[PDB]
């Protein structure tokens, strides 16, 4: 049980927070594991029903269930040891992606976590797919989808205006840095390769 | 998927019923190309006549001290509700009409539970041209807020009336506490089940199974 | 007979997890020849798959407030621990890894007869070469730990790394408050379940019978 | 119920105190009641269940236990009276091997168990089998079981120096001897022929 890669996603509404999360579940375990295998947490049930041993599961609104249930189901789903989520099913998801409306963590335990997240990144819409709705700035999800051309990596079925940064922009909460959400997935794809390679070195270390 | 929930709270005799019909006649005429909408009987266990209409109308939530309340969170829900008659439920708008100002259910515990599941949350009153005094209370005059004005606002209306306007009929939004029309209303759910359908879409295709 | 117990004591993300691995299958490759490791699953009062494995690792001692606590002072016995699943305990080499500084288990009143069945105390940590800062905690920089500086110290192993040195991986005999590597730790496990062997067969042999 | 013969063993850790305690136990016991018969008193349990009235009996780590019902334990177990372990089995053997690490006895009535005390040994690794391990000297066990030629004593299958003083030492705290494993056999098989002899003319006396 090596620890997953963690990607959080903070953003307001309407920005395309979930819509990215299972397009970055998808395309990530696509890319690696060879299929989709993505398992979105039930909301609000405690109760991982479901859950084959995906390769990357899903949380929703991390710091929106008032007592808590969430962030220690979050808190365990990456700490090292065996968690075991009601049914006896074992958690091995090698991807953990959650969605977000706190710009930053409150929830005395939370830098703990803090470790065990890889990448934070703030959601919002690019400015080429920006639209208003009810007085709303949010995701013109019309214009980002309309296909541009050849799939910017083999996963996609084709390039649209979500993949690139004038679509949607994820902002690096830690290197102040702007990456699409194609930047998004090969630099989670790149930590999990070398979390792979060093956990062959550590296993053909001793000769058997 | 999921539905699109609007709740209609609101005085009676304010609209409720009316506007809830016209907004399902309306919203499904829009997308899915012909009117398709079911009134869900009250006082009935049983989904009786669901032939998996587009809209489908609850009038009256908030009785029966739980059957409708209960009712209502399976009907918004992820998962494939069975109603009494079997059949999936497949609606992708749900209008419920209420008396309440809010919501605390006594068969749903939870009942912030219900709320992330309600997508717009109206009160509805005759607009200021359309209120007259009916026997000492204050109630919308049907007949001039349907008289016709000119061109239909949107297509899938024949003509404009006051119906279609804040000065004959207001929606309170419970959220933004902002003051909009019935076609406000009405465009607002379109753009609503429309992003849906299109994220749901791009969830399915584009990345590679 | 009874078997070698090694217990790592030590803070968590300092390798605990890995030296307790790569001590089981290395000294079970140099003894009995080929890798042969048993991980008890936590959260188990059942040992599902084992099948007499030579090393049993114990992963995180020292929690449900008290089955594994118990379950460690059986499997450590002269006499012949059947587990649920039926099968004897027949692992000469135990490692189990911990987060106390001490030990004063709960279930097992008398805690000094645990004491004389623990054959090597350590507690680990990341060593000055290899010790990062992560997030504001030190921690063991593990890809560095394991890249590849040369020949093998011991034949089972097929390369050096600084896992097996003290400058990379840091062992404090919390007996003779001594400093020792990864593989000083193999060497004198080994020492011992090798003494532990002759020293039977001479007891059973030898004197006739 | 006569008096057992009593061997204590002292020693520091690694010098082969429990082995030799059984290999005295094996050996004396195979010689004269003609087959190995060894009870091996169980660590802190006062139930001598498994005992069946063996020849010799085997008590490790006396002062050791800081509650003291060993040493009563082992009073008991040489007193001319008839002691009754736990279980109604009556206690017989005529050997008694103890081993210790204190360098001398300090528990009051500790004295009056001294005349019980028949030998007093210390253990430590002869000169050519002493071999260092983890900083400390201790017996070389492979040097020293290594088949060295027919066995000195018929209970024995070979020699090796184990057997040998120049392989593992025992002094004689008393005459400040130092002999070997063999030698401290045969003082106590001698002895216990002695005791045996004697007792003979006890029950021939009186005539039947
Ligand atoms: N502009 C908006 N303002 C307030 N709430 C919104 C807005 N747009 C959508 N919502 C509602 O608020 C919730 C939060 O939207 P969120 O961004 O988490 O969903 P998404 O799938 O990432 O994007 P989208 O809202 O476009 O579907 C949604 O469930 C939606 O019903
Ligand atoms: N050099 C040493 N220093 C400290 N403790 C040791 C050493 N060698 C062994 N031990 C441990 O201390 C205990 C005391 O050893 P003791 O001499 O009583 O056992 P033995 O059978 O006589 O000899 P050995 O220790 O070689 O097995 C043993 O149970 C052993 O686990």
Redesign the pocket.
């Given at each position: 049980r090596c620890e997953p890669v963690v990607i959080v996603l903070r953003?307001d509404?309407?920005?395309?927070?979930?819509?990215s999360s299972q397009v970055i579940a998808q395309a990530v375990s696509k890319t690696i594991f060879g299929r989709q295998s993505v398992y979105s947490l039930p909301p609000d049930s405690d109760f991982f029903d479901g859950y084959e041993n995906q390769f990357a599961a899903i949380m929703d609104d991390l710091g929106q269930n008032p007592d808590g249930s969430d962030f220690t189901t979050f808190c365990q789903m990456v700490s090292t040891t065996n968690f075991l989520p009601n049914m006896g099913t074992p958690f091995t998801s090698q991807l953990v992606v959650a969605?977000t409306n706190l710009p930053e963590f409150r929830p005395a335990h939370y830098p703990a976590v803090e470790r065990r997240i890889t990448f934070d990144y703030s959601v919002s819409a690019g400015p080429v797919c920006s639209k208003t709705?009810?007085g709303?700035k949010?995701?013109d999800?019309e214009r980002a989808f309309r296909p541009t051309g050849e799939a910017p990596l083999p996963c996609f079925q084709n390039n649209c205006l979500f993949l690139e940064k004038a679509g949607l922009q994820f902002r690096d909460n830690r290197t102040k840095e702007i990456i699409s959400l194609v930047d998004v997935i090969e630099r989670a794809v790149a930590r999990i390769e070398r979390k792979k390679k060093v956990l062959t070195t550590v296993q053909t270390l001793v000769a058997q």
């Amino acid at each position: 049980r090596c620890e997953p890669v963690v990607i959080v996603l903070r953003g307001d509404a309407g920005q395309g927070k979930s819509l990215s999360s299972q397009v970055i579940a998808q395309a990530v375990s696509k890319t690696i594991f060879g299929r989709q295998s993505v398992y979105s947490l039930p909301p609000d049930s405690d109760f991982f029903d479901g859950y084959e041993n995906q390769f990357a599961a899903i949380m929703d609104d991390l710091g929106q269930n008032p007592d808590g249930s969430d962030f220690t189901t979050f808190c365990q789903m990456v700490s090292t040891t065996n968690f075991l989520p009601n049914m006896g099913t074992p958690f091995t998801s090698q991807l953990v992606v959650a969605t977000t409306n706190l710009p930053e963590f409150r929830p005395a335990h939370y830098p703990a976590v803090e470790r065990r997240i890889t990448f934070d990144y703030s959601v919002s819409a690019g400015p080429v797919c920006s639209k208003t709705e009810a007085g709303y700035k949010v995701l013109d999800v019309e214009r980002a989808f309309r296909p541009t051309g050849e799939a910017p990596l083999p996963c996609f079925q084709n390039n649209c205006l979500f993949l690139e940064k004038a679509g949607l922009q994820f902002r690096d909460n830690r290197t102040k840095e702007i990456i699409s959400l194609v930047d998004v997935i090969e630099r989670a794809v790149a930590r999990i390769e070398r979390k792979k390679k060093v956990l062959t070195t550590v296993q053909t270390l001793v000769a058997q």
